[PDB]
């Protein structure tokens, strides 16, 4: 769109706010719904966030393209592994509780 930059800025704040609502959700209604929402929200927020760091600090067409490509790989693998953990293992909410029972 001709408004791609402002729509992206708005999407970032929305996902930040979404992630903020998922923390009460995880404490109060832990389960598959929250687990996968955290997988999605944590990956998207971190991806957009790391994208801002790249935009600030990486300069030059090729280093920019390289950093962003590696970021896509990192994000895609991160989301895959969190969904993997949620499906084959105890999932995010239960793992945290188990960690905190140590």
């Amino acid at each position: 769109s001709s408004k791609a930059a402002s729509l992206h800025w708005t999407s970032e704040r929305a996902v930040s706010a979404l992630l903020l609502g998922l923390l009460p959700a995880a404490y109060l209604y832990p389960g598959p719904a929250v687990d996968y929402s955290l997988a999605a929200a944590l990956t998207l927020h971190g991806h957009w966030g790391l994208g801002q760091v790249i935009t600030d600090y990486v300069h030059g067409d090729t280093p920019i393209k390289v950093a962003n490509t590696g970021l896509y790989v990192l994000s895609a693998i991160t989301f895959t592994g969190l969904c993997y953990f949620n499906y084959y293992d105890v999932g995010i909410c239960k793992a945290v509780a188990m960690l905190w029972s140590i």
């Binding site: 930040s16 903020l20 989301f79 969190l82 993997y84 105890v90």
Partner: protein, 139 residues
């Protein structure tokens, strides 16, 4: 008789090939609490993301599942004050980043931009980070 784009082009053309130095910046600039808190927000965000990504790699690559590693850790009978310190260390950056993240979202609504309020809200962020971390690590 020169457009803005041409002026910027000539600036970079002129200066990068010149013998002029770049005046110092980060090495000489005075710090403030908002400035320190701003970059700590970035550093905790990045650290949280690297932690989430490492956790995600461990789920794909480690030959045992999570309850095994929890059971292992308990078998070391670590001291309660050392357990508390690891819990506090884990939750502090999440805590900092969350509260300051809320502060950022208030700014994006246009509120709290008076410099004295920027200072108030930063200190408020720090005390909430401390209280919430100490309280959570005691759970």
């Amino acid at each position: 008789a020169t457009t803005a784009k041409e002026e910027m082009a000539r600036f970079w053309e002129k200066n990068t090939k010149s013998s002029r130095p770049l005046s110092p910046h980060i090495s000489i600039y005075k710090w403030s609490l908002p400035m320190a808190m701003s970059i700590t927000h970035r550093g905790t965000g990045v650290a949280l993301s690297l932690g989430v990504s490492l956790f995600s790699l461990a789920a794909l690559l480690l030959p045992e599942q999570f309850p095994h590693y929890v059971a292992v850790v308990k078998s070391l009978s670590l001291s309660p004050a050392l357990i508390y310190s690891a819990k506090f260390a884990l939750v502090f950056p999440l805590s900092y980043h969350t509260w300051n993240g809320i502060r950022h979202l208030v700014w994006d609504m246009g509120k709290g931009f008076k410099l004295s309020q920027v200072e108030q809200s930063g200190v408020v962020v720090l005390i909430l980070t401390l209280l919430s971390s100490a309280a959570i690590a005691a759970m």
